[PDB]
Amino acid sequence: YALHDIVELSAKNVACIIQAGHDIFKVIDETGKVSTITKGSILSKINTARARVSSVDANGNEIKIGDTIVEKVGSRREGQVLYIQTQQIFVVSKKIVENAGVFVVNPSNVEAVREVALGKTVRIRSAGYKGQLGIVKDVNGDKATVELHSKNKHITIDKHKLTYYNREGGEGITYDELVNRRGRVPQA
Amino acid sequence: LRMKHGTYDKLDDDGLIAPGVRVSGEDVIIGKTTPISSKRDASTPLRSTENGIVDQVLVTTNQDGLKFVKVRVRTTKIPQIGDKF
Amino acid sequence: MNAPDRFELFLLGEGESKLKIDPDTKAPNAVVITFEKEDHTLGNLIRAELLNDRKVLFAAYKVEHPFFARFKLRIQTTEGYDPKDALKNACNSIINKLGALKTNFETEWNLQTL
Amino acid sequence: MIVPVRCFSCGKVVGDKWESYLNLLQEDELDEGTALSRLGLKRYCCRRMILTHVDLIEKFLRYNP
Amino acid sequence: RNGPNEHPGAKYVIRDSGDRIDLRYSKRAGDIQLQYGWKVERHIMDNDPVLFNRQP
Amino acid sequence: KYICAECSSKLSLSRTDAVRCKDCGHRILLKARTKRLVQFEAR
Amino acid sequence: EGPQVKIREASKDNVDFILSNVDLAMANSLRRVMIAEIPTLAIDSVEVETNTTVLADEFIAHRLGLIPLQSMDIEQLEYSRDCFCEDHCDKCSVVLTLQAFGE
Ligand SMILES: [Zn+2]
Ligand SMILES: [Zn+2]
Ligand SMILES: [Zn+2]
16 A cells, blocks of 8 residues: 555545555544554555546535645645545645645535447438448547448548448438437348 | 457457458457467457458468468559659 | 548538628729639639620639639729629629520521431 | 440540450451541540550459359 | 547647546547646647658 | 358358368368448449 | 521531630630539449459449449439438439349
8 A cells, every 4th residue: 555545444434545654554534533554454445546436516516536626714725636435535735744735625615626329330311421331430429430431531420310220231220219229230 | 458449340250351341440350369378369450551341361271280361451542642653 | 541522522511601702902892702612614704704894894713722612703893883793794694695505506406407 | 354434534435345346356357546446436545545455354254263 | 629530629638637638539528628727739720830841 | 151262162160160171172261251231432 | 696506517426516706715614514514323332242253342333333324314313412311212313233143
């Protein structure tokens, strides 16, 4: 375990390390109390990057891990959020030396500073390349990138105006059955 | 554990794209996996700067009997401004 | 790999006007008309018709680049004569001449047995 | 492989007369220019399109596939 | 909003923290609100100086 | 799923099977074109 | 009166004539529209179901595209990009089938 690492002390206790030792670690808990524990007291390390935890600030703006926030009351400490607890947030600040710059604050007291089309043969309907077979590569949201079979170029076209066909021939279906009905190529 | 951007959907059950399949960018042409001791992908991605319709695929045995695959891809190139004559 | 859309040459793009008329400050009573998705075919004929009119003073067509199907026609007429009216008259004269030529060709073809 | 469908220069269709061209060269034993003129090729673009063509399609078909 | 696919657009957005977020891989590109001090990797536009050279 | 270079006869062999033609000793074992619909344009 | 046409000779697919009382620009524009702006019908899309000839699918498709097609009633036909159709409806396209094999 290294500095600033998140440690799951128990099923409901999460702490942040402020002084990473060999076998003895000083950790501040969600309640702000700083205590010294042993390596055995840590069940496992919580991965902040893989932790999909979000909270709501006073202004209502969503705050995620790593976002810079400033306390509305107190010393107005500014710092980056390392982890988000059910009722508390741990924030590390480079301007504070106390507790390695890590402090636990309430979220309300701070303010912030499955594609069906992909991988299926399609034909364009309303464009300059209508009626041309294409293979969907990726979708950027509201627009689908398709490579044309007869042309060595990739074109971005709205997916709603494309008709999808079966892997081998089959009938054409617009972008209304896959959204409603589960992704299933028609029968050839 | 080793997976590349190449789309493996074009690959069939045998692992080789049949003639008449559109391939572009890093799309995998030959699907090969080397067991590790469970296995790591060793596919042959298509040339990034070249693309076209796969023309032919053949499978044979090497001098030692190991499976060998050769895939020829054909593209139609039309004269452009930058072409040299 | 990035060749221009061939159909786009003669097809208007999304949110694109066929004609764009703007004033010209180089000379009084001078206008610039940008024709989109057009080639020398129409520009040269329109300019030639305009030059045949005594009232029209200056009429010049320019193609900025072969890549883009677009040209610009600068038209300057006498005081009190709107360039748009001159362009409309030239287009009407062109239509009349084309109709007369079509009628003459049809009559000649009908007259000839072959 | 096969005779071009249309002349590169003008676009006149020249693929119809390739078989007629070969027949005139062989059956009638006519010279190249006379046969081309009879086929109805005035502009030298089509003349060189037909004369310069090589029938590689037959050579490719010589193989079993 | 145009996105990397469209020429008058961008492909990466640099936040204040310095982390770079790609637009093509992110499906919520249109929901990203730019803030002062950030940097965006925009495609080179017209009247953009660039050094042209020949190897010799 | 496969054809012979010389015999040009279908084999439809499966995995963990010999790649040699059943009719002849040749083992080129070419593969037939994909059944997926293919479209081309004169442009 | 305007411009008049004097047809020196006519044929099935070749007509030589003379235009008089016409500007050079008008004649050039007429030639340009006649060579480029005349609508015509030609093979645009080629779908291959079973091809094993020595040639290539793109090659044969390009050859087919250049094949002339009757276009006397082209005006009646409408562009595919214009009419509201899914793909190559009978109202905007002509469908043909090519089948052959050796012996
Ligand atoms: Zn010719
Ligand atoms: Zn065999
Ligand atoms: Zn239609």
